[PDB]
């Protein structure tokens, strides 16, 4: 049975973008044995440069992500996504794939006191409407990377700044993902 390999690596798993900075740089590696076009998009207050370019087999290059316009809130973080796509009787089937590797672009004012892990423990929980609801009183996204309830794993999601998010039901335990993309310490609370 023939196999085909695909891979795109971004040199970090989140971008913390200081609000109003000129730009940041992010590396892309084509880890495969064939050339690709790398197609980068944000989901136009940010530009990614270059938006499309040839990256040869095994090579790495750098993207510039630059705030070029956009006004944004001054008390809270904002969230965008940077997506990086590597473009490579019988019924014969031929399928080609392309990976579109997406990471968080977190726009963060410089003025805001501390970082996310200083506030990880501040999440409060309720159960309502058949759902487990987290409340985030911090100005940061709390990017939960691991979440359990009654000791059962719950697929996680971020909790937005000054806001909530609601989880289907399967004592709450959670770890946020910190700014370097590592898992942070375990917190636990009764609802």
């Amino acid at each position: 049975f023939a196999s085909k390999e695909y891979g795109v690596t971004i040199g970090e798993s989140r971008i913390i973008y200081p609000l109003d900075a000129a730009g940041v740089m992010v590396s892309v590696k084509n880890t495969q044995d064939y050339p690709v076009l790398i197609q980068s998009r944000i989901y136009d207050p940010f530009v990614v440069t270059p938006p499309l370019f040839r990256l040869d087999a095994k090579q790495q290059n750098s993207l510039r992500i630059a705030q070029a316009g956009g006004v944004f809130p001054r008390d809270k973080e904002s969230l965008k996504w940077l997506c990086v796509k590597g473009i490579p009787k019988d019924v014969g089937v031929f399928v080609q794939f392309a990976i579109n590797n997406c990471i968080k672009l977190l726009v963060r004012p410089n003025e805001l006191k501390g970082t996310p892990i200083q506030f990880a423990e501040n999440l409060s929980w309720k159960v309502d409407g058949g759902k487990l609801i987290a409340e985030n009183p911090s100005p940061f996204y709390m990017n939960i990377g691991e979440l359990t309830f009654g000791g059962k794993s719950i697929p996680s999601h971020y909790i937005p700044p000054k806001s909530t998010w609601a989880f289907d039901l399967p004592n709450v335990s959670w770890r946020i993902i910190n700014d370097q993309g590592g898992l942070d310490r375990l917190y636990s609370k009764n609802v």
């Binding site: 690596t9 040199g11 019924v91 089937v93 399928v95 794939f97 590797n101 990377g145 996680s156």
Partner: protein, 136 residues
């Protein structure tokens, strides 16, 4: 800091043969996708397989002889406790609740459904599929 590496490996399944009436079999294993590199905690709802047809829940394969013969496939997998699960395919899940993906890598099976128009013809059928992963 931690890179976001994503890999995919596609293993082709057995040859497909049209039968005497003109249908392909249903539930045929077209091939197996192994997704890798993601960080543990990545969930099934954060993976979306898309194609040009864009039919929600299915990947559409089209003949290359200009007669526009099509068939659909689903993309499905199994979680640790053997519940059927599935990634989004054109934006929607066909089966299962949202789940955390298996550690290290997750296999997904591309399985035939059928042709809505029917009678297929022998030849080559293709699809170009984007796999978007939204890293935590």
């Amino acid at each position: 800091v931690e890179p976001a590496r994503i890999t995919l490996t596609y293993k082709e399944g057995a040859p497909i043969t049209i039968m005497d009436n003109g249908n392909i079999d249903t539930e045929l294993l077209v091939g197996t996708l192994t997704l890798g590199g993601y960080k543990t905690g990545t969930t099934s709802t954060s993976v979306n397989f898309t194609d040009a047809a864009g039919d929600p829940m299915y990947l559409t394969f089209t003949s290359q002889d200009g007669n526009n013969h099509q068939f659909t496939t689903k993309v499905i997998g199994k979680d640790s406790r053997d519940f059927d699960i599935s990634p989004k395919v054109n934006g929607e899940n066909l089966v299962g609740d949202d789940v955390v993906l298996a550690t290290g890598s997750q296999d997904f099976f591309v399985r035939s459904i059928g042709s809505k128009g029917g009678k297929l013809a022998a030849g080559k059928y293709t699809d170009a599929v984007t796999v978007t992963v939204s890293n935590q």
